[PDB]
Amino acid sequence: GLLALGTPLQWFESRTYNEHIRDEGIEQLLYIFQAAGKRDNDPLFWGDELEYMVVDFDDKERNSMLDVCHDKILTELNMEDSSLCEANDVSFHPEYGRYMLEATPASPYLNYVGSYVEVNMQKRRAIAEYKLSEYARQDSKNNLHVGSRSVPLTLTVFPRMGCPDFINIKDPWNHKNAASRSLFLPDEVINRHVRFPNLTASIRTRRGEKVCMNVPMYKDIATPETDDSIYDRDWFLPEDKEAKLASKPGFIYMDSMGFGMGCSCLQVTFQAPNINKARYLYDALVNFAPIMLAFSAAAPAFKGWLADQDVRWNVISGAVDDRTPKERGVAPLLPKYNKNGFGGIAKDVQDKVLEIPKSRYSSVDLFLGGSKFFNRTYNDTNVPINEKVLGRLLENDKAPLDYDLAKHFAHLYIRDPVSTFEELLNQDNKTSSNHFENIQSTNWQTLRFKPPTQQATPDKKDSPGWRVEFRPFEVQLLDFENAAYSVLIYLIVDSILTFSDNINAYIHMSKVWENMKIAHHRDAILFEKFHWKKSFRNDTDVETEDYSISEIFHNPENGIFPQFVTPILCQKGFVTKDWKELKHSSKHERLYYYLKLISDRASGELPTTAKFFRNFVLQHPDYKHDSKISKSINYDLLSTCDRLTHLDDSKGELTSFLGAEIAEYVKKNKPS
Ligand SMILES: Nc1ncnc2c1ncn2[C@@H]1O[C@H](COP(=O)(O)OP(=O)(O)O)[C@@H](O)[C@H]1O
Ligand SMILES: CCCC[S@](=O)(CC[C@H](N)C(=O)O)=NP(=O)(O)O
Ligand SMILES: [Mg+2]
Ligand SMILES: [Mg+2]
Ligand SMILES: [Mg+2]
Numbered sequence: 001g002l003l004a005l006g007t008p009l010q011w012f013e014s015r016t017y018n019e020h021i022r023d024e025g026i027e028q029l030l031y032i033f034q035a036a037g038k039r040d041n042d043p044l045f046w047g048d049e050l051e052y053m054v055v056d057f058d059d060k061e062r063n064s065m066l067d068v069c070h071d072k073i074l075t076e077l078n079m080e081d082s083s084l085c086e087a088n089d090v091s092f093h094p095e096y097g098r099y100m101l102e103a104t105p106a107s108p109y110l111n112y113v114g115s116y117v118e119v120n121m122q123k124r125r126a127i128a129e130y131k132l133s134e135y136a137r138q139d140s141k142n143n144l145h146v147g148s149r150s151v152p153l154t155l156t157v158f159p160r161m162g163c164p165d166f167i168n169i170k171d172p173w174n175h176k177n178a179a180s181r182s183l184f185l186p187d188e189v190i191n192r193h194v195r196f197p198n199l200t201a202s203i204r205t206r207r208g209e210k211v212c213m214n215v216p217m218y219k220d221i222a223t224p225e226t227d228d229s230i231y232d233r234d235w236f237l238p239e240d241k242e243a244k245l246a247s248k249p250g251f252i253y254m255d256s257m258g259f260g261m262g263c264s265c266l267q268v269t270f271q272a273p274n275i276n277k278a279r280y281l282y283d284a285l286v287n288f289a290p291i292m293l294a295f296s297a298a299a300p301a302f303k304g305w306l307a308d309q310d311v312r313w314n315v316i317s318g319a320v321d322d323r324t325p326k327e328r329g330v331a332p333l334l335p336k337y338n339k340n341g342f343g344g345i346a347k348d349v350q351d352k353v354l355e356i357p358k359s360r361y362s363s364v365d366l367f368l369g370g371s372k373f374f375n376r377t378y379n380d381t382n383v384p385i386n387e388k389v390l391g392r393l394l395e396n397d398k399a400p401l402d403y404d405l406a407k408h409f410a411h412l413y414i415r416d417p418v419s420t421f422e423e424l425l426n427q428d429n430k431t432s433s434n435h436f437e438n439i440q441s442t443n444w445q446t447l448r449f450k451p452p453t454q455q456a457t458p459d460k461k462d463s464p465g466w467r468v469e470f471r472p473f474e475v476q477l478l479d480f481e482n483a484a485y486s487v488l489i490y491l492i493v494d495s496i497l498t499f500s501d502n503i504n505a506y507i508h509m510s511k512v513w514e515n516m517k518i519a520h521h522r523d524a525i526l527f528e529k530f531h532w533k534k535s536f537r538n539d540t541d542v543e544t545e546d547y548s549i550s551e552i553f554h555n556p557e558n559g560i561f562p563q564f565v566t567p568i569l570c571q572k573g574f575v576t577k578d579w580k581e582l583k584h585s586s587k588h589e590r591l592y593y594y595l596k597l598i599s600d601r602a603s604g605e606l607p608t609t610a611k612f613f614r615n616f617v618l619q620h621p622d623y624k625h626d627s628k629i630s631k632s633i634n635y636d637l638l639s640t641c642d643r644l645t646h647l648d649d650s651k652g653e654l655t656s657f658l659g660a661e662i663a664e665y666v667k668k669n670k671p672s
Helices: 011-036 082-087 116-141 195-207 275-285 288-296 313-319 347-352 387-394 403-412 434-440 479-498 509-518 549-554 560-571 579-584 589-602 609-618 631-645 653-668
Strands: 045-058 063-066 090-093 100-105 148-153 213-216 251-254 266-271 447-450 467-470 529-533 544-548
Touching: 011 195, 011 387, 011 434, 045 116, 045 479, 045 631, 063 631, 082 090, 090 116, 100 116, 116 148, 116 479, 148 631, 213 313, 251 313, 266 479, 275 288, 275 447, 275 467, 275 479, 288 467, 288 479, 288 509, 288 529, 288 549, 387 403, 467 479, 479 560, 479 589, 509 529, 529 549, 544 549, 549 560, 549 589, 560 579, 560 589, 579 589, 589 653, 609 631, 631 653
Parallel strands: none
Antiparallel strands: 045 063, 045 100, 045 148, 045 266, 090 100, 213 251, 266 467, 447 467, 529 544
């Protein structure tokens, strides 16, 4: 669904309501617990969110651009073509990028739904390409976007973001981009819904410096020693003078929110039976997050460069990192503009500013606890909290909370609201969660623990309950892959929820954080090791060893297949003994190829999308052994991606990417 209208407040004007917004959202949250705290026996509803990028192929010029001119698609799919969507069980909404689409099923899946995830993902995609073909008929007749061919691709990263000729707007630099003030992204990369340029502007003003994301450059025989795309400019002070100071030799420099929030992911959200199981599930999924990031890697290039990393995470982390240099415990790059390293923080609250170790977009900070295996000593890392919020969640007359749950919320509330509408400044806290949502939705982490609304009282059985969002997955090109990875986590969640008396997944948080750094390394999946529990079926045991992704998926004692997946499949009767029995299942064959694809990637038998892209660039005739992705390499890569998406093996690319057995299989068998 399309986002409702508002008048955003810009940072200088909105910062004055930070405490008001925090206070009133805490009250809203208290009403939610008071109303929905005792929900129970909620069904296992779940659903995915896919994010897409609309790419314009200029086949005559050999240039694939991002398409920032067909964003009406989102309004039309939510207006006069919404009937198409509803009939087809899909729903569409905006994302940060003006070229992006997001789509979900219109109703959650319930329990195990087989091939229907993939069916539903194919329908989302077929409806987007339908709309796009309609525009191509209109444009033809109005003689517009002549030569151009727009295709939705589930890319994690656009390899040429912020590089010359990367958007289908002639001469986008003939005006200034006051929102991001980036050297590379015109503000047309941003979706027109006012929230998005608001967040962009708000986060930069608060920080008092452009966002800054330095990603290690892959080092080839002829790679420049610096990011030679940086340039001096004079539109904006201080921002146009930052790059010289902020960049680093051997690092890709990115300076704008769209480099991160202009990237895409797969997400899956699950409803637990009640809040307690929701805490248990959340805690248990914490170390799956860095593992699945590493496993799904789909981002080996940024801003026209091959990177020495394989996932998007740290780039998105920096893109919305509103921390002043004070909060980061570093000097302002330009002390004359960034007064005392406080950026846009009001002086009459600079005395309350904390040093905060992680960006508001970062891995989970705290186990919620509240289950039998939990011990507060597993929360062993630096996690600042808003003490006032903790105090109030502990002592109040609506819903006093246990200390571990209170500390989760209090950590979330160390942040300021960065997107605030004038209209919404005073709410009815009994019925509204908008203020709480303000902070909740702008703490972006590897999981999200989702309260219901005040409306979701236990008697109302169909309301959304206590939910856990699983956020780390990179998005893959094929709907077959995304459904494989969606069902994977489904089966892991069902496993956790089913065997909850016996699964101890606790490890020290400091280890998870370390895993998150390791998951970024180039080819991590193929050789790096990760702290993973030695056993899950052991009261009090929180011993880890360091296991490869292959061992983490396949070890009999602690592996995802033998301890999570296979046990749930036996238990639900899909198999007697082993997951591989599905190959010869009459009802369940596709589930076999889903799992086989996963296992073969986890063992290094099939490449990740990140590796496939990297090979593609490195093996390209025009590649100049210097780390650069040119318009021409970009064009061929994305043509390949278009063929892969569409199971087009005419050039053997699908066989090359999925191997013969899976390729032949998806080419001859449609999900149904
Ligand atoms: N009751 C429910 N339990 C679990 N998941 C749900 C439920 N209702 C909807 N979902 C799924 O939650 C996700 C919500 O998507 P979205 O509106 O994109 O929210 P957000 O951006 O906050 O994650 C979708 O995948 C949707 O299918
Ligand atoms: C600025 C708005 C961001 C909304 S978002 O957090 C983006 C997810 C990101 N594209 C990623 O690759 O991790 N998805 P949702 O809010 O639909 O869960
Ligand atoms: Mg969403
Ligand atoms: Mg999203
Ligand atoms: Mg989401």
